[PDB]
Amino acid sequence: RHGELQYLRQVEHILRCGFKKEDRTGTGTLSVFGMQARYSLRDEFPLLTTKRVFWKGVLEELLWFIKGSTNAKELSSKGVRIWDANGSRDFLDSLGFSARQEGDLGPVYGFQWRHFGAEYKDMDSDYSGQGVDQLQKVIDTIKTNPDDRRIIMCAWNPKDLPLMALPPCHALCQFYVVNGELSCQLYQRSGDMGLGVPFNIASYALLTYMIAHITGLQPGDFVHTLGDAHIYLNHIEPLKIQLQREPRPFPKLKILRKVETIDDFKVEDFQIEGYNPHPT
Amino acid sequence: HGELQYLRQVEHILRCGFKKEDRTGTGTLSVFGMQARYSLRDEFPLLTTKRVFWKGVLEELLWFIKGSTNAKELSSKGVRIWDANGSRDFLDSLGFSARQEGDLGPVYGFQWRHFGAEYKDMDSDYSGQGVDQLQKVIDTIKTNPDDRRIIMCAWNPKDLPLMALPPCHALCQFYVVNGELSCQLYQRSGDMGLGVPFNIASYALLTYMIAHITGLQPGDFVHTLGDAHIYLNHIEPLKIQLQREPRPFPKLKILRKVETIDDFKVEDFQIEGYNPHP
Ligand SMILES: O=C1OC(c2ccc(O)cc2)(c2ccc(O)cc2)c2ccccc21
């Protein structure tokens, strides 16, 4: 009943029953369409243990989303370089974004979360007060109407898709409250089980911890829903080895001071305790 | 039998759901996060343990497809499910007193065909405005079946204040493998007793239509729920329905070759072998 066994069973399922299917580069995957897992957030934190997850990247990326940044260099300057290739001069040129400064990802996550529907110009523009601040709306609704069934933050913006260096893999999420507990469901249109999915689970579990903290609630569940769940073909043999490792008890996530607004969270406010992932 | 997934979801909520009130303070039993997979392969998942309103399923979907946001254009087909949301007493509730009766605001039909366009009223001409997500999905399926971004999203944060009701069916995603077209719906709120069987039929039908248009075979319909709930007044009726054994699903037949999604008509469809319980 360790929560990571769900993830292992999803990987096993794709290895056994997935179909060969290729991505935009013509590279092969094994793929299943439509999966779901539930990770409890109650006195533990689902940071996967059968292979180490880049927690520093999880935390800094989420803080970067929250402040609305679309500059890959603003994340890279924290030592987190996962978005840098998508803002490179050559990649941006290949998409027709010649006039963009290097690092300008377009209206990706942070912009849609804080300024949905505003007109994007570039990554250095001031978007204060423009568009729908979905993130603060979710927090507001949780505080005042926890029964609400419309508590959604949606990064999928069909109008803005052509401007993005990458359309969001995490298309939308929904929050839910019962019994003083805050839950979150992510709709992820595409998930690389080997590398991306563990990171994305941590990301939305952390966001739920953050929002629960500032709304006075306790973390409940993170429900992970996938569209195209896939394993790259050259990852099959390492994953078969990983699948025979027993999960170690999940770590705990501690928030080290009372924080009042989502914008006030800082990297030093968080401590992962007892994280003991299997080595690679 | 694929209907057993639905029955076990109902059973789970009656067993493990928590009491949770809705907008009207009326009580439900609720579970957050559920998923079921309904095969579309040589059968159609129109539930059999209780009759589903198939004519309403089909006419509502045709109404979405032509982009209408006028409940009176659907009611004129004898399908009244949207009429209350467009009534003058309900629009006034939401501060929409200057709005014509029947004007639902920028709901499914507008978002599917004109996402991002500026809504005015249900009588406006939106030709060529906004993103036609429906046609874009069909195009991408035809040209890039491997695409992992084949999404139609009715959830529009900018337009929510203008809507008579924000979409329960927030988005759906299509997927192609082995010549088969699948569809996954993200439904943020599901009334298991009254709404969900209708909703399953709707998106299974959309998948049959797009598969027909694109030369593919229907695959799976994957139903994902947020707040899956049962109104307390429905508990004993569902408890009886849970005792009913499902009959084999009917088949859906498309009676002619249709070239575009806009060309489908009610007469093109025939449900074969539908034998539901009362
Ligand atoms: O470069 C990285 O992108 C990943 C990532 C995903 C979502 C996100 O929001 C941020 C990053 C990713 C992993 C696998 C993929 O197939 C594509 C991307 C990732 C996870 C962990 C470590 C590095 C990376």
Curated annotation (Swiss-Prot), chain A:
GO CC annotations on file: cytoplasm; mitochondrial inner membrane; mitochondrial matrix; mitochondrion; nucleus
Residue positions where Phosphoserine is found in the record: S88
Pathway(s) this gene product operates in, as recorded in its UniProt entry: Pyrimidine metabolism; dTTP biosynthesis
Sequence positions that bind (6R)-5,10-methylene-5,6,7,8-tetrahydrofolate: D192
Keyword presence, Nucleus: yes
Enzyme Commission (EC) number: 2.1.1.45
Subcellular location: Nucleus; Cytoplasm; Mitochondrion; Mitochondrion matrix
Enzyme class: transferase
Gene Ontology molecular function: any one: sequence-specific mRNA binding
Alphabetical list of Pfam families matching this protein: Thymidylat_synt (PF00303)
GO biological processes: dTMP biosynthetic process; dTTP biosynthetic process; methylation; tetrahydrofolate interconversion
UniProt catalytic activity: dUMP + (6R)-5,10-methylene-5,6,7,8-tetrahydrofolate = 7,8-dihydrofolate + dTMP
Active site: C169 (nucleophile)
Family annotation (Gene3D superfamilies): Thymidylate synthase/dCMP hydroxymethylase domain
Keywords of the record: Cytoplasm, Isopeptide bond, Membrane, Methyltransferase, Mitochondrion, Mitochondrion inner membrane, Nucleotide biosynthesis, Nucleus, Phosphoprotein, Transferase, Ubl conjugation
Position of the Glycyl lysine isopeptide (Lys-Gly) (interchain with G-Cter in SUMO2) cross-link: K266
Assembly, per entry: Homodimer.
HAMAP family, alphabetized: Thymidy_synth_bact (MF_00008)
PANTHER family: THYMIDYLATE SYNTHASE, THYMIDYLATE SYNTHASE 1
Protein purpose: Catalyzes the reductive methylation of 2'-deoxyuridine 5'-monophosphate (dUMP) to thymidine 5'-monophosphate (dTMP), using the cosubstrate, 5,10- methylenetetrahydrofolate (CH2H4folate) as a 1-carbon donor and reductant and contributes to the de novo mitochondrial thymidylate biosynthesis pathway.
Protein name: Thymidylate synthase
